[PDB]
Amino acid sequence: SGAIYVGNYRVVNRHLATHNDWANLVWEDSSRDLLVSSTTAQGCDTIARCDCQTGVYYCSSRRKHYPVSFSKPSLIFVEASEYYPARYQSHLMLAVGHSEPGDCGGILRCQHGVVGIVSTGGNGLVGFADVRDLLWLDEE
Numbered sequence: 001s002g003a004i005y006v007g008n009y010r011v012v013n014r015h016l017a018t019h020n021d022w023a024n025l026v027w028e029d030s031s032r033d034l035l036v037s038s039t040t041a042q043g044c045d046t047i048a049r050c051d052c053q054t055g056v057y058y059c060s061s062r063r064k065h066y067p068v069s070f071s072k073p074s075l076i077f078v079e080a081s082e083y084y085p086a087r088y089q090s091h092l093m094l095a096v097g098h099s100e101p102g103d104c105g106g107i108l109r110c111q112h113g114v115v116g117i118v119s120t121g122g123n124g125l126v127g128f129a130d131v132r133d134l135l136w137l138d139e140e
């Protein structure tokens with residue numbers, strides 16, 4: 001679990017969105033595994049606006065933050081899960097790091113700010129849904 005809280009937005013994995021998220025929907029994209037809802041309180045996270053390929057992510061199944069090198073956002077085949085059939089996910093970045101299904105929502109960050117959230121993984125890989133192209137989250 002986990003979310004990004006920037007301005008009056010809450011960014012979560014679409015597959016973990018609650019009824020309250022759907023009832024306060026701003027934007028969602030199934031191909032990216034992302035959903036954004038509106039918040040009453042202002043958040044403290046800021047979004048990175050960069051092309052970094054190194055950063056640090058939070059792994060809830062280890063209670064630890066790990067440094068990672070990651071690929072640029074791209075279209076990658078993701079195996080079937082209880083949340084989606086096997087399909088291509090867009091704007092996804094892969095890294096070598098531990099992950100388990102419930103690690104989704106952990107933040108990946110770089111020196112500039114938040115880069116994205118854990119969305120896919122297995123067998124010593126972890127995949128992150130990029131948010132750096134969503135300019136409307138923070139200075140729009």
Ligand SMILES: Cn1nc(C(=O)N[C@H]2CCOC2)c2ccccc21
Pocket residue numbers: 015033078080081082083084099100101102103104118119120121122123126127
């Ligand atoms: C971090 N992580 N995520 C999944 C996963 O199945 N994600 C789907 C749900 C949303 O997009 C694909 C996974 C599986 C096995 C080990 C780790 C894992």
Ligand SMILES: [Zn+2]
Pocket residue numbers: 048049050051052110111112113
């Ligand atoms: Zn950066």
